[model samples]
Target: SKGEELFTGVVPILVELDGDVNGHKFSVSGEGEGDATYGKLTLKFICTTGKLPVPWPTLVTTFVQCFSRYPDHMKRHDFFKSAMPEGYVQERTIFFKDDGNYKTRAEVKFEGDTLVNRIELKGIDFKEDGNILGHKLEYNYNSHNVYIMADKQKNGIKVNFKIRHNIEDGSVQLADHYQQNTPIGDGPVLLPDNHYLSCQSALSKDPNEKRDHMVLLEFVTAAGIT
Candidate 1:
């Protein structure tokens, strides 16, 4: 309740993560209340491994807008288009709100994407003695392993994760999938009520290996869809 009032003015926010990695649209969007002690956040992340080229309408407009940097075409152009190369891989984990329900951590392997995977975690035992909000907060599995294998070789990729949530700032920070202590990508992105943060960072020299972690937190005053 304190988190809801403090962060959303007693309203709930819709949190969404839209990741642009290897030109693939990896999106995880959801809704939840602001309760540092006892709130639940639900999210659905859709991963697309293969994608078609950007339509001319969008591409031409982007190029025309940033024609000044024509010499450095890739700075903006490549972001709109890039071929996923072989041996391209990325790993990242997102930490949200507060404590997670360790007992509720579950996985669902679907049959759609090349590496279709789903995970849900709920945090009980909410500790109200913090600067942040939410208790029994539900969050997506902190770390998701992204393996872009050659179509020729179908491939796949969470265990022993130290989930850390700084309740005061209400910010989510991405960490190395392999090492929790090692931070990844950008800052402890602040989740201010209804705003979303788009962060992109490279993990290795291989330009193809990058991380795009986007978080959108929207508040709601009434009960709505999750």
Candidate 2:
């Protein structure tokens, strides 16, 4: 049975990022498999910052890393193999500044020792339009910057990417305070428009019983000025 085999073959791997100031913590844990013709990996993370004050909303963030693999020679040579062997490193960082008001969140993904993708969030604010017009509760001006390298170099690499933003979605706004806050839940709070907040949690079994080696990643955060 493929499902049974998947359950037996999965191996758990854990990664973590912690802030020095506020006891905030972020962590990732998941299961993976490697083989001659293919490979697979999946990880979930939780990040927690802290509570909010008054009108300032709480910010939270979450991250997921899937399909990181290291291929063997047989897997590399087979053109029909859907799975390509590759190595990867995934990292998430949160930072805070200015009496715990400013925040920044960053996530990076690597493939075969090369950085393939990066996402950054910062500077959030709850605006009048979001609170009143859209009943959106909170809003903030933030940017979602993504980067992909064209080729690898000795010292660095060339990247091609775009920056999109939302005044209502706050991701980066919470990360600026990474030094002060502690992630409390499974990971970060994923907002509606691809936004996220910070929080943390340790490894745990997935609530869903169907998957043999799945774990839940959860976290929470608060809104603040940058």
Candidate 3:
């Protein structure tokens, strides 16, 4: 007789929306049937040009270090910290090497009660090398409907979302980084009509100049796990 094949199960645990309206904040949660260990993942969308936020290696290190501070919130903090630089710089730095090793610098700015982080990159100077690439890009989150907040005046809106998966299988590491046009179909896609000015798009006519793009990741876990 043929041997029976064993199977590993994968499923979505909880889905929720986290955002604010008229200064009142709230979150909606959904539960699924399962006894397996569950982990939360949050994705943040950002526009950029050239390289993504902090190099891959540096990002891993920074993530681990920051998560250590808030072990309980490791998943959320780890993902957010990965989007920042290890060393704080008063001014942004632009790197240009003759050997095609070009680098553009950006800054992370935070806002009031609502945690708003902005990353802007200098457009490439196409005139220097006859490269005619536009300077605009957008980031997209992977999960489902998370949370969103509308402007105080009630004229604008914002949305936030998150997804849960198993950590033992290492599915979280599969996140991919890429550049695309603004207005993502799922997750929190920043549109031009929002009340917030920063969420608007930044496109330039310069052929050489380019915009920077980034994606924010937030990890979450249940209680008793440090």
Candidate 4:
């Protein structure tokens, strides 16, 4: 939450991780149940300079949500050690100004092509999910979770998520389907940060700057949409 490059005056930017990871597109796309490809991961987030709108709108907060996870996981791997990896896995969060506003943090790692990225959505608000299409959104800061509360009767449809530094061994976790025995892949498997955040925290003198990066499994439902 402290050192994660929370850009100011930023509409959004697409800095691809490296390669095959482009499919690592997180927020721009979504998957649904009963569709032709409801379970397979589809990497299709198109980004260029155009992503940042002209006269980039101000990031006036309707409200801002914040929290912390952990930093130890990133240190467990060697790949988390670098800013530039071979296959550009961008664990993207936001790139629009209108209603797609969200907060995300991610790390990436890859062997050959497939990446097992890791990310914790420490904050999400006003997510305009494509399928449901609505303006209603809320996060449970009390227990790290998000609710895509869509008032189909009112405003309608929207969505988002993802973590890069793509961890192949990465696992996922989703809250909507609990105990009802949802999809097998929809479970917690991923781990922590780029490893350096922990390093940053341990070195910080201010308690406010203490270690707080969220380390969680990927949302099994959101993991590549399976």
* Best candidate according to TM-score: 2
User: How high is the CA lDDT of each candidate model?
Assistant: 0.21, 0.27, 0.23, 0.21
Q: With candidate 2 superimposed using the best TM-score fit, by how many Å does residue 12's alpha carbon deviate from the native? A: 4.3
The RMSD (Cα, Å) of candidate 3 is: 20.4
What local lDDT score does residue 186 receive in model 4, on the 0 to 100 scale?
A: 22
Q: What is the C-alpha RMSD of each candidate to the true structure, in Å?
A: 21.1, 14.9, 20.4, 18.7
Point to the candidate with the largest lDDT.
2
Candidate 3 residue-wise lDDT at 129: 27
For model 3, residues 30-132, the per-residue Cα lDDT tens digits are 2222111223222222222233322221121011111112233323312223322221111122222221111222222222211122222332322222111
Provide the lowest-lDDT 10-residue window in model 4.
Answer: 55-64
Candidate 2 runs further than 4 Å off: 1-12, 20-40, 46-147, 150-226
> Where does candidate 4 stray beyond 4 Å?
1-95, 111-114, 127-226
Q: Residue 153 lDDT in model 2?
A: 23
TM-score against native, each model: 0.22, 0.27, 0.21, 0.19
lDDT assessment of candidate 2: 0.27
Ranking by TM-score: 2, 1, 3, 4
Report the error of model 3 at residue 25, Å.
36
Model 2: per-residue Cα lDDT over 84-193, one tens digit each: 11212222232322113224333333244222222232333433243312233333222322222211122112222221222245422232221211112222221111
